[PDB]
């Protein structure tokens with residue numbers, strides 16, 4: 001009687017690890033949530049066919065409010081798996097669910113999978129140079145989130161890159177595009193005047209990481225803000241000072257303006 | 266005409282993704298490098314058996330000096346796979362290899378897999394709170410590198426966690442232990458006296474991430490410096506101020522002392 005937290009990866013059903021698949025295939029009950037991220041290259045049906053089990057999808061409320069009443073009860077007398085997009089413990093609050101598991105006397109194990117947090121390495125930007133991360137949240141009513149702007153400022157001041165997770169409204173089927181994120185950032189800039197994000201700021205966009213042909217683009221906000229980066233999910237990155245090799249990759253692979261090759265050391 | 270960069274994941278031969286395995290199986294030639302890191306929970310033989318292909322292992326020199334003479338020629342007229350521990354392109358030197366492919370008229374695609382960079386999510390520490398990362402290198406002769414100490418200092422003063430990759434002598438398969446890293450840091454502290462790493466510093470050790478039975482331990486240096494965390498690899502994290510939820514996970518899951526709930530939050 002145990003509970004497995006198993007990541008499904010970045011884009012499609014084949015992004016699950018072999019370990020995760022073999023373990024999922026032998027579980028008695030399989031649950032999953034698809035509100036923390038978007039797997040744009042698969043369907044519930046394909047995932048179900050791969051693991052050979054029926055998958056009960058849980059809503060954010062089911063998990064946050066009733067994980068211990070829906071999943072844990074079964075884990076006390078059966079092998080249960082809880083599937084999630086990407087890595088189950090990255091940019092989610094699922095780690096806390098392991099405490100609930102302990103309290104219920106249920107042992108839990110974690111099976112990792114490709115995460116967008118590390119996949120950004122495909123942009124050519126050195127992973128160790130990424131600083132604090134942030135999420136660009138949709139404004140709601142009179143509330144306009146701006147914390148992410150300060151994160152960029154803090155990292156950039158230290159010469160570090162900033163990974164910006166983009167908002168998602170699973171129920172409404174709304175996925176924030178890199179374009180919308182840029183528009184919001186420009187609005188915060190006009191409000192704060194920190195000189196952190198402007199039309200001349202160099203940015204990198206990574207869309208549908210995990211697919212064989214993800215969209216990887218780098219350039220100035222003024223040029224990319226109205227560019228079509230394809231279907232979601234998208235992630236936006238605001239690089240700090242570039243090493244020469246980072247600039248070379250952005251130019252050669254992400255189509256960045258050749259002028260960025262001339263770094264100001 | 267195609268080169269696939271395929272990640273092998275965290276620990277053993279089943280940490281490769283289903284996508285990576287199926288693609289590797291269909292490749293005409295398969296190369297691999299084990300110098301950026303190692304796969305401690307498996308062997309080349311077990312990886313070969315899973316993929317059902319002979320694996321040509323390449324040294325750091327083979328890759329950095331002769332990638333275009335060893336791998337690319339075959340990729341020109343065949344489907345070739347290049348396996349790497351973890352997630353491809355996390356290691357800083359990997360990215361440039363895609364430019365080499367482009368220069369040789371070879372298409373390249375990246376197949377992601379779990380990376381320790383994202384797997385640390387299992388420590389319960391929020392991924393967004395991780396700042397710049399660093400590597401603790403073994404001092405040698407008259408060379409005593411200490412830049413990693415400064416990374417911790419700069420992250421911590423901003424309330425961010427610091428991921429410290431530990432040194433490895435790839436060919437000899439000798440891993441720096443978290444204990445050795447702590448000893449080194451106390452030594453650097455005694456030299457810099459910045460009050461960044463002392464007996465009272467709270468640290469988190471993650472050993473054998475990817476395994477079903479990783480060791481996750483949190484506590485003060487004075488208590489953990491001589492503790493046995495099991496077989497390698499080891500990762501050391503120096504967290505910044507903790508969110509109560511992070512602290513509760515460290516206490517409940519990582520055996521941290523209750524004291525952290527009042528001292529480090």
Ligand SMILES: Nc1ncnc2c1ncn2[C@@H]1O[C@H](CSCC[C@H](N)C(=O)O)[C@@H](O)[C@H]1O
Nearest residue numbers: 037086087090091115116166208209234235
């Ligand atoms: N394949 C992908 N391509 C681009 N962005 C992605 C992505 N998968 C996730 N994201 C980004 O991350 C956000 C979800 S955050 C949850 C992340 C997940 N646990 C993981 O490990 O990846 C999305 O709204 C999007 O901005």
